[PDB]
Coordinates of C-alpha atoms and ligand atoms in Angstrom, one line a residue:
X1 CA -0.9 -32.2 6.9
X2 CA -2.0 -28.9 8.5
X3 CA -3.3 -26.5 5.9
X4 CA -2.3 -23.0 6.9
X5 CA -3.7 -20.7 4.2
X6 CA -6.8 -21.6 2.1
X7 CA -6.1 -18.8 -0.4
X8 CA -3.2 -21.0 -1.6
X9 CA -3.4 -24.2 -3.6
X10 CA 0.2 -25.0 -3.1
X11 CA 1.7 -27.5 -0.7
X12 CA 1.4 -25.9 2.8
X13 CA 4.4 -24.7 4.8
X14 CA 3.9 -27.7 7.1
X15 CA 4.7 -30.1 4.2
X16 CA 7.5 -28.1 2.4
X17 CA 9.0 -24.6 2.4
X18 CA 10.5 -22.7 -0.4
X19 CA 13.9 -21.3 1.0
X20 CA 15.1 -19.4 -2.1
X21 CA 14.2 -18.3 -5.6
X22 CA 16.6 -17.7 -8.4
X23 CA 14.7 -15.8 -11.2
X24 CA 16.3 -15.5 -14.6
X25 CA 13.8 -13.8 -16.9
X26 CA 13.5 -11.4 -19.9
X27 CA 10.9 -8.6 -20.3
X28 CA 9.4 -8.4 -23.8
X29 CA 7.4 -5.2 -24.2
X30 CA 6.2 -6.1 -27.7
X31 CA 4.4 -9.2 -26.4
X32 CA 3.9 -7.9 -22.9
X33 CA 5.4 -11.2 -21.4
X34 CA 8.0 -12.1 -18.8
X35 CA 9.8 -15.3 -19.9
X36 CA 12.4 -17.3 -18.1
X37 CA 13.2 -19.8 -15.4
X38 CA 12.3 -19.9 -11.7
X39 CA 14.6 -22.1 -9.6
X40 CA 13.1 -22.8 -6.3
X41 CA 15.1 -24.3 -3.5
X42 CA 12.6 -26.2 -1.5
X43 CA 13.0 -27.9 2.0
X44 CA 10.8 -30.8 2.9
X45 CA 9.3 -30.9 6.4
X46 CA 8.2 -34.5 6.0
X47 CA 9.7 -37.9 5.2
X48 CA 8.9 -39.7 1.9
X49 CA 7.8 -36.6 0.2
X50 CA 7.4 -37.6 -3.5
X51 CA 5.3 -34.7 -5.0
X52 CA 4.6 -31.1 -4.2
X53 CA 2.1 -28.5 -5.5
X54 CA 2.7 -24.8 -6.5
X55 CA 0.3 -22.0 -7.2
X56 CA 0.0 -20.7 -10.7
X57 CA -2.3 -18.3 -12.5
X58 CA -2.4 -17.9 -16.3
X59 CA 1.1 -19.2 -16.7
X60 CA 2.4 -21.2 -19.6
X61 CA 4.8 -23.9 -18.4
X62 CA 7.4 -25.1 -20.9
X63 CA 9.2 -27.7 -18.7
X64 CA 10.3 -28.5 -15.1
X65 CA 13.9 -29.8 -14.6
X66 CA 15.3 -31.4 -11.5
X67 CA 18.8 -32.8 -11.2
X68 CA 19.4 -32.4 -14.9
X69 CA 16.3 -34.3 -16.1
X70 CA 12.9 -33.1 -17.1
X71 CA 10.2 -34.3 -14.7
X72 CA 6.5 -34.9 -15.0
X73 CA 4.1 -32.2 -13.9
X74 CA 0.3 -31.6 -14.2
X75 CA -1.8 -28.5 -14.0
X76 CA -5.0 -28.9 -12.1
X77 CA -8.4 -27.4 -12.8
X78 CA -8.7 -23.7 -12.3
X79 CA -10.2 -22.6 -9.0
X80 CA -11.7 -19.2 -9.8
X81 CA -9.4 -16.3 -8.5
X82 CA -6.9 -18.8 -6.9
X83 CA -5.7 -20.0 -10.3
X84 CA -4.5 -23.5 -11.1
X85 CA -2.5 -25.8 -8.9
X86 CA 0.7 -27.2 -10.5
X87 CA 1.7 -30.7 -9.2
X88 CA 5.3 -31.7 -9.7
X89 CA 6.5 -35.3 -9.4
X90 CA 9.9 -35.5 -7.7
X91 CA 12.6 -37.9 -9.0
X92 CA 13.4 -38.9 -5.5
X93 CA 11.6 -39.2 -2.1
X94 CA 12.6 -36.4 0.2
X95 CA 13.2 -36.7 3.9
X96 CA 12.6 -34.2 6.6
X97 CA 14.8 -31.1 6.2
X98 CA 16.1 -32.4 2.8
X99 CA 16.3 -29.9 0.0
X100 CA 15.9 -30.0 -3.8
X101 CA 16.1 -27.4 -6.5
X102 CA 13.3 -27.2 -9.0
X103 CA 13.8 -25.2 -12.2
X104 CA 10.5 -24.2 -14.0
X105 CA 10.7 -22.6 -17.4
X106 CA 7.6 -20.3 -17.7
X107 CA 6.0 -17.5 -19.5
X108 CA 3.4 -15.0 -18.2
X109 CA 0.2 -14.0 -19.9
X110 CA -0.1 -10.5 -21.4
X111 CA -3.3 -10.3 -19.3
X112 CA -1.3 -11.4 -16.1
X113 CA -3.1 -9.8 -13.1
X114 CA 0.2 -9.1 -11.5
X115 CA 1.9 -7.1 -14.2
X116 CA 0.9 -3.6 -15.2
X117 CA 2.1 -2.6 -18.7
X118 CA 1.9 1.1 -19.6
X119 CA 2.1 2.4 -23.1
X120 CA 4.4 5.3 -23.8
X121 CA 1.4 7.7 -23.7
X122 CA 0.7 6.5 -20.1
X123 CA 4.2 7.6 -18.9
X124 CA 5.7 11.0 -18.1
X125 CA 8.2 10.8 -20.9
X126 CA 5.9 9.7 -23.7
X127 CA 8.6 7.7 -25.6
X128 CA 9.3 4.5 -23.7
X129 CA 6.8 1.9 -22.3
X130 CA 6.9 1.0 -18.6
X131 CA 6.2 -2.0 -16.4
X132 CA 5.5 -2.4 -12.8
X133 CA 4.3 -5.4 -10.7
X134 CA 1.6 -5.5 -8.0
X135 CA 1.6 -8.9 -6.4
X136 CA -0.3 -8.1 -3.1
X137 CA -2.3 -10.1 -2.2
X138 CA -2.2 -13.3 -4.3
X139 CA -0.9 -12.2 -7.7
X140 CA 2.7 -13.5 -7.4
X141 CA 1.3 -16.7 -8.8
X142 CA 0.5 -14.9 -12.0
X143 CA 4.2 -14.0 -12.4
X144 CA 5.8 -17.3 -11.5
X145 CA 5.0 -20.6 -9.8
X146 CA 5.4 -20.4 -6.1
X147 CA 3.8 -21.2 -2.7
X148 CA 1.8 -18.0 -3.0
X149 CA 1.1 -17.5 0.7
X150 CA 2.7 -15.1 3.3
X151 CA 3.1 -18.2 5.5
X152 CA 6.3 -19.0 3.5
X153 CA 9.3 -16.7 3.4
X154 CA 12.2 -17.0 1.0
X155 CA 15.3 -15.1 -0.1
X156 CA 15.9 -14.5 -3.8
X157 CA 18.4 -13.4 -6.5
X158 CA 17.3 -12.3 -9.9
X159 CA 18.7 -11.6 -13.4
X160 CA 16.5 -9.5 -15.6
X161 CA 17.1 -8.9 -19.4
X162 CA 15.5 -5.7 -20.6
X163 CA 15.9 -3.4 -23.7
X164 CA 19.2 -1.6 -23.1
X165 CA 17.5 1.8 -23.2
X166 CA 15.6 0.9 -20.0
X167 CA 16.4 0.1 -16.4
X168 CA 15.0 -2.6 -14.1
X169 CA 14.6 -2.3 -10.3
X170 CA 13.3 -5.0 -7.8
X171 CA 12.4 -5.3 -4.2
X172 CA 16.1 -6.2 -3.6
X173 CA 19.6 -4.7 -3.4
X174 CA 20.9 -3.8 -6.8
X175 CA 23.8 -6.1 -7.8
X176 CA 25.1 -4.8 -11.1
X177 CA 24.4 -4.6 -14.8
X178 CA 26.0 -6.1 -17.9
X179 CA 25.2 -6.3 -21.6
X180 CA 23.1 -9.3 -22.4
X181 CA 25.6 -11.8 -24.0
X182 CA 22.8 -13.3 -26.0
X183 CA 21.5 -10.0 -27.3
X184 CA 23.4 -6.7 -27.8
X185 CA 20.2 -4.8 -27.8
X186 CA 19.6 -5.7 -24.2
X187 CA 21.0 -5.3 -20.6
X188 CA 20.9 -7.8 -17.7
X189 CA 20.3 -6.3 -14.3
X190 CA 20.9 -8.4 -11.2
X191 CA 19.4 -8.2 -7.7
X192 CA 19.8 -9.9 -4.4
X193 CA 17.4 -10.1 -1.5
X194 CA 19.2 -11.7 1.6
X195 CA 16.3 -11.1 4.0
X196 CA 13.5 -13.7 3.7
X197 CA 10.3 -12.2 2.4
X198 CA 6.8 -13.5 1.6
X199 CA 6.3 -13.7 -2.1
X200 CA 3.7 -11.0 -2.3
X201 CA 6.7 -8.5 -1.7
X202 CA 8.5 -9.7 -4.8
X203 CA 8.4 -6.6 -7.1
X204 CA 9.7 -5.6 -10.5
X205 CA 9.7 -2.3 -12.4
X206 CA 11.2 -1.7 -15.8
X207 CA 11.3 1.7 -17.4
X208 CA 13.2 4.8 -18.4
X209 CA 14.5 5.5 -14.9
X210 CA 16.9 7.9 -13.4
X211 CA 18.2 8.2 -9.8
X212 CA 19.4 10.8 -7.3
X213 CA 21.2 9.8 -4.1
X214 CA 19.5 11.4 -1.0
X215 CA 21.0 9.5 1.7
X216 CA 23.7 7.0 2.7
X217 CA 21.2 4.2 2.0
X218 CA 18.6 5.9 -0.2
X219 CA 18.4 6.7 -4.0
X220 CA 15.1 8.1 -5.3
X221 CA 14.2 6.7 -8.8
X222 CA 11.7 8.1 -11.4
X223 CA 11.3 9.1 -14.9
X224 CA 13.5 12.2 -15.8
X225 CA 10.4 14.4 -15.6
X226 CA 10.0 13.7 -11.9
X227 CA 13.4 12.7 -10.4
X228 CA 14.7 16.2 -9.4
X229 CA 11.4 17.4 -7.7
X230 CA 11.3 14.0 -6.0
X231 CA 14.9 14.2 -4.7
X232 CA 13.9 17.5 -2.9
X233 CA 10.4 16.4 -1.7
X234 CA 11.8 13.3 0.0
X235 CA 15.2 14.7 1.1
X236 CA 14.4 14.0 4.8
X237 CA 13.9 10.2 4.2
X238 CA 17.0 9.2 6.1
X239 CA 16.0 11.2 9.2
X240 CA 12.7 9.4 9.1
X241 CA 14.5 6.1 8.8
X242 CA 16.6 6.9 11.9
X243 CA 13.5 7.7 13.9
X244 CA 11.8 4.4 12.9
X245 CA 14.9 2.5 13.9
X246 CA 14.8 4.2 17.4
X247 CA 11.1 3.2 17.7
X248 CA 11.1 -0.4 16.3
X249 CA 14.7 -1.6 16.3
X250 CA 17.3 -1.9 13.6
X251 CA 16.5 -1.6 9.9
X252 CA 17.7 -5.1 8.7
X253 CA 17.2 -4.6 4.9
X254 CA 20.3 -2.6 3.9
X255 CA 19.1 -0.2 1.3
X256 CA 15.9 1.9 1.4
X257 CA 15.3 3.2 -2.1
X258 CA 12.2 5.1 -3.3
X259 CA 10.4 4.8 -6.6
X260 CA 8.1 7.7 -7.7
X261 CA 5.7 6.1 -10.1
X262 CA 4.3 7.8 -13.2
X263 CA 1.4 10.3 -12.9
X264 CA -1.0 7.7 -14.3
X265 CA -0.4 5.5 -11.3
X266 CA -3.8 4.8 -9.8
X267 CA -2.8 3.7 -6.3
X268 CA -1.1 4.7 -3.1
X269 CA 2.3 3.5 -1.9
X270 CA 3.5 0.0 -1.6
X271 CA 6.1 -1.2 0.9
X272 CA 8.2 -3.2 -1.4
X273 CA 11.4 -4.2 0.4
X274 CA 14.4 -2.0 -0.4
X275 CA 12.2 -0.1 -3.0
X276 CA 9.2 1.7 -1.6
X277 CA 6.6 2.7 -4.2
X278 CA 5.5 6.3 -4.0
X279 CA 2.6 8.0 -5.7
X280 CA 3.6 11.2 -7.4
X281 CA 0.6 13.0 -5.9
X282 CA 2.8 13.4 -2.8
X283 CA 4.9 16.0 -4.8
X284 CA 3.3 19.1 -3.1
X285 CA 6.3 21.3 -3.4
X286 CA 6.5 22.2 0.3
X287 CA 7.0 18.7 1.7
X288 CA 3.7 18.9 3.5
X289 CA 2.9 15.3 2.4
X290 CA 6.4 13.8 2.7
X291 CA 5.7 12.2 6.0
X292 CA 3.1 10.0 4.4
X293 CA 5.9 7.5 3.4
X294 CA 6.3 6.8 7.2
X295 CA 3.6 4.3 6.4
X296 CA 5.7 2.3 4.0
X297 CA 8.9 2.9 6.1
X298 CA 7.1 1.3 9.1
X299 CA 6.1 -1.8 7.2
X300 CA 9.9 -2.6 7.1
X301 CA 9.2 -3.9 10.7
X302 CA 5.6 -4.6 10.8
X303 CA 4.5 -6.7 7.7
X304 CA 7.8 -7.3 6.0
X305 CA 9.8 -8.6 8.9
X306 CA 6.9 -9.8 11.1
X307 CA 4.3 -11.0 8.6
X308 CA 0.7 -12.2 8.8
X309 CA 0.5 -15.9 8.3
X310 CA -2.6 -15.7 6.2
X311 CA -4.7 -12.9 4.8
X312 CA -7.3 -13.3 7.6
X313 CA -4.7 -11.8 9.9
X314 CA -3.8 -8.9 7.7
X315 CA -4.7 -6.5 10.5
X316 CA -1.5 -7.6 12.4
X317 CA 0.4 -6.1 9.5
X318 CA -1.4 -2.8 8.8
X319 CA -2.5 -2.2 12.4
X320 CA 1.0 -2.3 13.9
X321 CA 2.3 -0.4 10.9
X322 CA -0.2 2.5 11.4
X323 CA 0.8 2.4 15.2
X324 CA 4.5 2.7 14.4
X325 CA 3.8 5.3 11.7
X326 CA 1.8 7.5 14.1
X327 CA 4.8 7.3 16.5
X328 CA 7.2 8.5 13.7
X329 CA 4.9 11.4 13.1
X330 CA 4.6 12.0 16.9
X331 CA 8.4 12.2 17.0
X332 CA 8.5 14.6 14.1
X333 CA 5.6 16.9 15.1
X334 CA 4.8 16.1 18.8
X335 CA 2.5 13.9 20.8
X336 CA -0.4 16.3 20.2
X337 CA 0.0 15.6 16.6
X338 CA 0.0 11.8 17.1
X339 CA -3.3 12.3 18.7
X340 CA -4.6 14.5 15.9
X341 CA -3.7 11.7 13.4
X342 CA -5.2 9.1 15.7
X343 CA -8.5 11.0 16.0
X344 CA -8.7 11.5 12.3
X345 CA -8.1 7.7 12.0
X346 CA -11.1 7.0 14.2
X347 CA -13.1 9.3 12.0
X348 CA -12.2 7.1 9.0
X349 CA -13.2 3.9 10.7
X350 CA -16.6 5.5 11.5
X351 CA -17.1 6.2 7.8
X352 CA -15.8 2.7 6.7
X353 CA -18.1 1.0 9.1
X354 CA -21.1 3.2 7.9
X355 CA -20.2 2.4 4.3
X356 CA -20.0 -1.4 4.7
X357 CA -22.7 -1.5 7.3
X358 CA -22.1 -2.2 11.0
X359 CA -22.9 -6.0 10.6
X360 CA -20.7 -6.5 7.5
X361 CA -18.1 -9.3 7.9
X362 CA -15.4 -7.1 6.5
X363 CA -15.6 -4.8 9.6
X364 CA -14.2 -7.5 11.7
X365 CA -10.6 -7.3 12.5
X366 CA -10.0 -11.1 12.0
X367 CA -11.8 -11.9 8.7
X368 CA -12.6 -15.3 7.3
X369 CA -11.5 -15.2 3.6
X370 CA -12.3 -18.9 2.9
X371 CA -14.3 -18.2 -0.2
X372 CA -13.5 -14.5 -0.6
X373 CA -10.8 -13.1 -3.0
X374 CA -8.2 -11.4 -0.8
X375 CA -7.3 -9.2 -3.7
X376 CA -10.5 -7.3 -3.4
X377 CA -10.8 -7.4 0.4
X378 CA -8.9 -4.2 1.3
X379 CA -10.5 -1.5 3.4
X380 CA -9.7 1.0 6.1
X381 CA -10.8 -1.5 8.9
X382 CA -7.5 -3.4 9.2
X383 CA -5.7 0.0 9.2
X384 CA -7.9 1.9 11.7
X385 CA -9.6 -0.8 13.8
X386 CA -6.2 -2.4 14.3
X387 CA -4.6 0.9 15.2
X388 CA -7.5 1.6 17.7
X389 CA -7.1 -1.7 19.4
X390 CA -3.3 -0.9 19.9
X391 CA -4.0 2.6 21.0
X392 CA -6.5 1.4 23.5
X393 CA -4.1 -1.2 24.8
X394 CA -1.3 1.4 25.0
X395 CA -3.5 3.5 27.3
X396 CA -4.6 0.5 29.3
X397 CA -1.1 -0.8 29.9
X398 CA 0.8 2.3 31.0
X399 CA 1.3 4.6 28.0
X400 CA 3.4 4.9 24.9
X401 CA 6.9 4.3 26.2
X402 CA 5.8 1.1 27.9
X403 CA 3.8 -0.1 24.9
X404 CA 6.7 0.8 22.7
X405 CA 8.7 -1.7 24.7
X406 CA 6.2 -4.3 23.7
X407 CA 6.3 -3.3 20.1
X408 CA 10.2 -3.8 20.0
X409 CA 10.0 -7.1 21.8
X410 CA 7.3 -8.3 19.4
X411 CA 9.4 -7.4 16.4
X412 CA 12.4 -9.1 17.9
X413 CA 10.4 -12.2 18.8
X414 CA 8.8 -12.7 15.4
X415 CA 11.3 -11.3 13.0
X416 CA 11.6 -13.3 9.7
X417 CA 8.5 -15.3 10.8
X418 CA 4.8 -15.4 9.9
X419 CA 2.2 -15.3 12.6
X420 CA -1.5 -15.3 13.5
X421 CA -3.7 -13.2 15.8
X422 CA -3.5 -15.9 18.5
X423 CA 0.4 -15.8 18.3
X424 CA 0.2 -12.0 18.8
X425 CA -2.2 -12.2 21.7
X426 CA -0.2 -15.0 23.4
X427 CA 2.9 -12.9 23.1
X428 CA 1.0 -9.8 24.5
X429 CA -0.1 -11.9 27.5
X430 CA 3.4 -13.2 28.0
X431 CA 5.1 -9.8 27.8
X432 CA 2.5 -8.2 30.0
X433 CA 2.0 -11.1 32.4
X434 CA 2.5 -8.6 35.2
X435 CA -0.7 -6.9 34.0
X436 CA -2.9 -10.0 33.1
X437 CA -5.8 -8.7 35.3
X438 CA -5.9 -5.6 33.2
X439 CA -5.7 -7.6 29.9
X440 CA -8.6 -9.9 31.0
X441 CA -11.0 -6.9 31.1
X442 CA -10.6 -6.4 27.4
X443 CA -13.5 -7.6 25.4
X444 CA -11.4 -9.6 22.9
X445 CA -14.5 -11.2 21.3
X446 CA -15.8 -7.8 20.4
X447 CA -12.5 -6.2 19.4
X448 CA -11.1 -9.2 17.3
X449 CA -14.1 -11.2 16.0
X450 CA -17.2 -8.8 16.0
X451 CA -18.3 -6.4 13.2
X452 CA -18.9 -2.7 13.6
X453 CA -17.3 -0.1 15.7
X454 CA -15.0 -1.1 18.6
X455 CA -16.7 -1.5 22.0
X456 CA -14.6 1.3 23.6
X457 CA -13.2 4.5 22.1
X458 CA -9.7 5.5 23.2
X459 CA -8.9 8.9 24.8
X460 CA -7.9 11.5 22.2
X461 CA -6.2 14.8 22.9
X462 CA -8.3 17.4 21.1
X463 CA -5.9 20.4 21.0
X464 CA -5.1 20.4 17.4
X465 CA -8.6 19.2 16.2
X466 CA -10.7 21.7 18.1
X467 CA -9.1 24.5 16.1
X468 CA -10.4 23.0 12.8
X469 CA -13.9 22.3 14.4
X470 CA -14.2 25.8 15.7
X471 CA -13.8 27.3 12.3
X472 CA -15.9 24.6 10.6
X473 CA -18.9 25.4 12.8
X474 CA -18.5 29.1 12.0
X475 CA -18.8 29.0 8.2
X476 CA -21.6 26.5 8.0
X477 CA -23.8 28.3 10.5
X478 CA -23.4 31.7 8.8
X479 CA -25.5 34.0 6.6
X480 CA -24.8 36.6 4.0
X481 CA -24.9 39.2 6.8
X482 CA -21.7 37.6 8.3
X483 CA -19.5 36.7 5.2
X484 CA -17.6 40.0 5.6
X485 CA -16.7 38.8 9.2
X486 CA -14.1 36.4 7.6
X487 CA -10.5 37.3 7.0
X488 CA -7.2 35.7 6.3
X489 CA -6.3 35.7 10.1
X490 CA -8.8 32.8 10.5
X491 CA -6.0 30.5 9.2
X492 CA -3.0 32.1 11.0
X493 CA -2.2 29.1 13.4
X494 CA -3.4 26.2 11.3
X495 CA -1.0 23.7 9.7
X496 CA -1.4 22.2 6.3
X497 CA -2.8 19.1 8.2
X498 CA -5.3 21.3 10.0
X499 CA -6.2 23.1 6.7
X500 CA -6.9 19.6 5.2
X501 CA -9.0 18.7 8.4
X502 CA -11.0 22.0 8.1
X503 CA -11.9 21.2 4.4
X504 CA -12.8 17.7 5.4
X505 CA -15.3 18.9 7.9
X506 CA -16.6 21.6 5.6
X507 CA -17.1 19.2 2.7
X508 CA -18.9 16.8 4.9
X509 CA -21.8 19.3 5.1
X510 CA -21.7 20.5 1.5
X511 CA -23.2 22.2 -0.3
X512 CA -22.5 25.8 0.8
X513 CA -24.3 28.7 -0.7
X514 CA -22.3 30.3 -3.5
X515 CA -21.7 33.4 -1.6
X516 CA -19.8 31.5 1.1
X517 CA -17.5 29.6 -1.2
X518 CA -16.9 32.8 -3.3
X519 CA -16.0 34.6 0.0
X520 CA -14.1 31.6 1.2
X521 CA -11.9 31.9 -1.9
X522 CA -11.7 35.7 -1.5
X523 CA -10.2 35.5 2.1
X524 CA -8.6 32.1 2.1
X525 CA -7.6 31.6 -1.6
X526 CA -7.7 27.9 -1.5
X527 CA -7.3 28.0 -5.3
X528 CA -3.6 28.5 -4.9
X529 CA -2.8 25.5 -2.7
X530 CA -1.0 22.6 -4.6
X531 CA -1.1 20.0 -1.8
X532 CA -3.0 17.3 -3.5
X533 CA -5.0 16.4 -0.3
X534 CA -6.1 20.1 0.3
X535 CA -6.6 20.9 -3.4
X536 CA -8.8 17.8 -3.8
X537 CA -11.3 18.4 -1.0
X538 CA -11.5 22.1 -1.9
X539 CA -12.4 21.4 -5.5
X540 CA -15.0 18.9 -4.5
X541 CA -16.6 21.5 -2.3
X542 CA -16.8 24.0 -5.1
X543 CA -18.4 21.6 -7.6
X544 CA -20.8 20.1 -5.1
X545 CA -21.9 23.7 -4.4
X546 CA -22.2 24.7 -8.1
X547 CA -19.5 27.2 -8.6
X548 CA -18.6 27.9 -12.2
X549 CA -15.0 29.0 -11.6
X550 CA -14.1 25.5 -10.3
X551 CA -15.0 23.5 -13.4
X552 CA -11.7 24.0 -15.2
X553 CA -9.6 23.5 -12.1
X554 CA -11.2 20.2 -11.2
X555 CA -11.0 18.9 -14.8
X556 CA -7.3 19.7 -14.7
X557 CA -6.5 18.0 -11.4
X558 CA -8.6 15.0 -12.6
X559 CA -6.5 14.4 -15.7
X560 CA -3.0 15.7 -14.7
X561 CA -2.8 12.7 -12.4
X562 CA -4.5 9.3 -12.2
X563 CA -4.7 8.4 -8.5
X564 CA -8.1 6.8 -8.2
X565 CA -8.8 8.5 -4.7
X566 CA -8.9 11.9 -6.5
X567 CA -9.6 11.3 -10.2
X568 CA -12.8 9.2 -9.7
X569 CA -14.7 11.4 -7.2
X570 CA -13.7 14.5 -9.2
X571 CA -15.3 13.1 -12.4
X572 CA -18.3 11.9 -10.3
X573 CA -18.9 15.5 -9.0
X574 CA -18.3 17.0 -12.5
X575 CA -20.8 14.4 -14.0
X576 CA -23.3 15.3 -11.3
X577 CA -23.0 19.0 -11.7
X578 CA -25.3 19.5 -14.7
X579 CA -23.3 22.6 -15.8
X580 CA -20.1 20.6 -16.3
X581 CA -21.4 17.1 -17.1
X582 CA -21.0 17.5 -20.9
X583 CA -17.5 19.0 -20.6
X584 CA -16.5 16.2 -18.1
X585 CA -17.5 13.5 -20.6
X586 CA -15.7 15.3 -23.4
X587 CA -12.5 15.8 -21.3
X588 CA -12.5 12.2 -20.3
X589 CA -12.6 11.0 -24.0
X590 CA -9.8 13.4 -24.9
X591 CA -7.4 12.1 -22.1
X592 CA -8.4 8.5 -21.5
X593 CA -5.6 7.1 -23.7
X594 CA -3.1 8.6 -21.2
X595 CA -4.8 7.2 -18.1
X596 CA -4.1 3.9 -16.6
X597 CA -6.4 1.4 -18.2
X598 CA -8.3 0.7 -14.9
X599 CA -8.8 4.4 -14.2
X600 CA -10.0 4.9 -17.7
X601 CA -12.4 2.0 -17.4
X602 CA -13.9 3.0 -14.0
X603 CA -14.3 6.7 -14.9
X604 CA -15.9 5.6 -18.2
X605 CA -18.3 3.5 -16.2
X606 CA -19.1 6.3 -13.9
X607 CA -19.6 8.7 -16.9
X608 CA -21.9 6.0 -18.3
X609 CA -20.1 5.7 -21.6
Ligands
ZN701 ZN1 0.1 -0.5 4.5

């Protein structure tokens, strides 16, 4: 049979497809285990199907029951990061389209790569522990046995037993709570996901969670320490959803809840269906970062509804998501702003290609992950090279309203399906058959299969960017004789996004003489800004130019939150600044117990402890 996805060891979708999962499990914080049963409804695509294979990783299997009787099963040899295949002998031979229910009793490993267990000290509230999953790309197989490939999409229902003081949430619609009948110290939370999803979008959180309703289809959830601030910061979520619906078609998932993770959370957002994960570093206080969740909102069409069939084609997901997201922001702030964000994106692609090297296989849009762990293959290239291809095509084919018609038709065509780059390109050619002569001038080989920068750069409106450049080239090429020439007015017409962009361009040419940065503080007072993006780049600029006043401010930001994007480079700068190195090592030791274990480990490695 045709093998779809080489990152999966399970029977491929051409042989059988999982249609539904019923998960009944219990979360044990003492053992750091999930225990229970996974009932998979599986549909055969062949005749005479007598066995099938599932992905697993570090699972303990107690038994497999089919039609009331335990069945034989065998775990195969482990294949590195893919885990161990689990072969199940069926009690009957299945015919094409025939279905069977397979109930696997399992327990996860405390070292499960999919499950992040936090100690009380690593939470906001400091009393209760906390659990969150992170299945993308191929970690769902370390939670339960499955066809762990986005080429298969299933619905699911779940029942999750947790200590009664805690709350469970999942990538699904909440479906009620009851006391656990087998244990009065525990509650059972139920969930239902009626839209078929790839299993990497199965997600679970258990913790001391509270909610605020902020829209007809939106609750925000967090620990009590963050929930009120979060309800304000993200109060415009519903208006963003309505904009996304206008751009991409109906939102099919029912609810759109938000979860603001604990400060120790080392990552960015995650587009879990019905429950977007939000990093708390977006809590700027002025909503200047609230539009960032337009990324996860957009995945509800591009990635979650139309999905990449394998991880080689992940750019189809991220690329179309960034394209939709930049349209949401264009609706909110204007077309000039969409071009501002697009041009910044091109800059990030330049940096990514330079970091990897322009011949590196990961700077291709379509990547071959045959012998590469997809869990460690993420970069900005699918995001920004994919966006650039779509923005180039938009300009080639008659502009944004016309290409937005293509986007809507593409979503409608492939909703609830999983597709490859060739499926996408075939549909592009079909939709734009009236313009094939134009499409045939595109260097598809270069764009899709070649490393490095794209062969053509799109046309970017420069209005909002030129402002930041103008001021950037003024500070750098200045002497002590000119520092008095700066004043607050220099920032009068610059948005928070433009402030961020100015600091980005200024940091890129660090160090600045101390007189300049001292002046820059005197007139601009960047010490006062709380926007995590702005505060980050500013503090790096101060340390990399050896200002004493900045040492305590950077140490504070580096330990108050654990997002790797900020915490790691800050400790790197503080370690590299000889004046602060000793203090940076000492502060790390004092706070490392409250960090996420992976942040604690990598900063320790950087600090050479
Ligand atoms: Zn994304």
